A paper describes a structure:
Sirtuins constitute a family of NAD+-dependent enzymes that catalyse the cleavage of various acyl groups from the ∊-amino group of lysines. Sirtuins consist of a highly conserved catalytic deacylase domain of around 275 amino acids that is flanked by unstructured N- and C-termini that differ in their length and in their sequence. Of the seven members of the human sirtuin family, [name] is mainly found in the cytoplasm, while [name] is the main mitochondrial deacylase.
Numbering used by the authors:
A (entry chain A): 54 to 354
B (entry chain B): 56 to 355
The structure:
Amino acid sequence: HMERLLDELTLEGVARYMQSERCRRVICLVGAGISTSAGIPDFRSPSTGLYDNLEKYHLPYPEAIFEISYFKKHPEPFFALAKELYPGQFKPTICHYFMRLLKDKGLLLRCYTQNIDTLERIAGLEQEDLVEAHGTFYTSHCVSASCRHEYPLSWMKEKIFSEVTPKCEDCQSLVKPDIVFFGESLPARFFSCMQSDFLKVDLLLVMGTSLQVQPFASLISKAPLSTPRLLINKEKAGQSDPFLGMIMGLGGGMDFDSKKAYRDVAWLGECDQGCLALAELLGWKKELEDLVRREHASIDA
Amino acid sequence: ERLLDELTLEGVARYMQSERCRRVICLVGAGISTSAGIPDFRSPSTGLYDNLEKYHLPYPEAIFEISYFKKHPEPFFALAKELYPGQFKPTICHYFMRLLKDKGLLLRCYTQNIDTLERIAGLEQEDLVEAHGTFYTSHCVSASCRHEYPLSWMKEKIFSEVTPKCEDCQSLVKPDIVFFGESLPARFFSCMQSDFLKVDLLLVMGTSLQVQPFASLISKAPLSTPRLLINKEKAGQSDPFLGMIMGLGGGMDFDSKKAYRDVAWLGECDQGCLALAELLGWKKELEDLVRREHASIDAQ
Ligand SMILES: Nc1ncnc2c1ncn2[C@@H]1O[C@H](COP(=O)(O)OP(=O)(O)OC[C@H]2O[C@H](O)[C@H](O)[C@@H]2O)[C@@H](O)[C@H]1O
Ligand SMILES: Nc1ncnc2c1ncn2[C@@H]1O[C@H](COP(=O)(O)OP(=O)(O)OC[C@H]2O[C@H](O)[C@H](O)[C@@H]2O)[C@@H](O)[C@H]1O
Ligand SMILES: NC(=O)[C@H]1CCCCc2c1[nH]c1ccc(Cl)cc21
Ligand SMILES: NC(=O)[C@H]1CCCCc2c1[nH]c1ccc(Cl)cc21
Ligand SMILES: NC(=O)[C@H]1CCCCc2c1[nH]c1ccc(Cl)cc21
Ligand SMILES: NC(=O)[C@H]1CCCCc2c1[nH]c1ccc(Cl)cc21
Ligand SMILES: [Zn+2]
Ligand SMILES: [Zn+2]
């Protein structure tokens, strides 16, 4: 028995599902695409993404800048980049406030984000609503596993803006913000929330991510088989033919287009515009626009 | 659900002797051929990816990556000329799988190797999924053309220092070994759909399980199917870390408090298989097979 929960594979089909009694608990899965309209670059957009804009650091490959083994050999490019990107003041987007609407309508079980920009918090989601799957810059740690001395943000900021490579005062090993680099463990909260959240999710809303890194990309496969999954993104993601070096596990992807497609919908365009379009369908558009307006003005005050 | 009486080689052996254990699938990588003189990829210092400095690659894997290959095919065809001429013998591990087949237990061997030592050991093409392809045939890389060429054609080009070119469309021609970014053989998929439905035991040997989709295979068995790893190091087990190869929960659980079906025997693949053969009472038989087959090869 496969439960067929969407009456059609469109944004309109999803919206009707959301209004029904059957849709109680939504998980948002989000990445750097939801913050681009605020001024923050993403990673893997050709030419505009951060990984196509690190020429000056002379890295062996772009991912090295956020990679734990490279970092330990050559910490300077990371701290140089942090000094550049940290100052930027950004505001949440329409997409972030849409998630606030879910929260305030009793629909948000959790937002899992791969971003460190904190814009989900700034938009009004609370700690408990959030899994910051790829860490936070708020706290820092010595990288030495036998030490792990914790340091606060003021300590880290002071080091970066004094152009001093932060070192632990106990063991002299490098210190870094708790943002998750390639090769580094995810916060424990990720796994503990995931195990219970994904048993009871009625809709996955996947926004502004290419699903190109594990274990985050595995989350789509943790949902029950009947749970509809809506992608709002510039491009399809999670749907590709298998090949050697593919990121997802075999049969772990999205199925928007095949003869067997039953539950996955791709809305192709900007996240803000897709969130506006979906809010319109749900009768929430004015409320959303009102909230954005009010919260931006308040942020300026 | 627990089928092993204990999570040890002994427990696995007793399970293999039970009526329940009809169908065994072997999942193998380059570790089963190191004792035969062939380097693996990822072992420190000795592995192939730690010994490509001369080709000045941006990263080691680029030598077996399709887009890099089209732009710079010279390194791979240089590397192939060095390695193709080596002559090697199947290992005790390879003959242990031959024994599985002859005992009527082998449903399939899925290999990530292109050395053919499985075939040389006596496994037949029907027993095999050569998951990462074969050198025996070669194809033009152009999707509109796909002209096939045999081994003789490819060797003539390699050993004359001529970058192989399709005689029709002039595109590059490579052996049907699977590069990063390339499709796996059709057979991998059709066999996978059918083989893992009723599989009673997975035997994973000599692989770091560091590449997809091959690494997914362990998670295709039913949840109750025991899985035994014979390998120098543990593979398939970690906490969630960014960039990990395994899907979340698609790995092995040897050491957790909830561990119920995975067993890791750490050591040499050869000695591992001997130890298991011993526990099944096959040790003399295996040793006889190895000796005769190695003598047969020596006799050229
Ligand atoms: N305004 C927009 N509207 C909709 N989609 C967009 C927009 N802007 C960009 N996109 C799409 O948004 C997607 C952005 O994908 P990626 O750039 O890979 O970011 P990630 O968050 O998935 O990266 C994950 C991790 O990898 C890193 O190493 C870090 O660890 C990250 O946390 C693309 O599909 C764009 O087409
Ligand atoms: N004699 C031995 N006994 C036991 N274990 C061994 C032995 N020798 C090596 N090992 C272990 O055996 C493992 C060797 O793992 P890797 O070197 O990654 O080879 P793969 O076949 O998995 O590489 C997969 C693909 O990656 C490439 O891109 C190609 O596409 C390959 O087909 C390690 O865990 C060793 O500790
Ligand atoms: N908008 C975000 O926050 C994205 C994109 C901007 C750069 C920082 C960044 C993001 N996600 C990350 C995950 C891990 C690390 Cl080390 C850094 C980042
Ligand atoms: N500018 C900021 O508001 C935040 C969030 C936006 C992305 C850049 C970014 C921030 N903090 C960082 C710390 C380190 C790095 Cl590499 C990048 C960043
Ligand atoms: N020499 C041979 O017995 C075989 C199997 C052993 C590994 C090397 C190897 C062989 N054939 C090859 C063709 C191309 C490349 Cl790149 C490498 C090889
Ligand atoms: N013993 C094998 O055959 C291993 C290790 C020796 C090098 C060739 C090689 C192996 N596996 C492969 C998979 C794909 C490619 Cl392109 C090449 C190889
Ligand atoms: Zn320390
Ligand atoms: Zn051709």
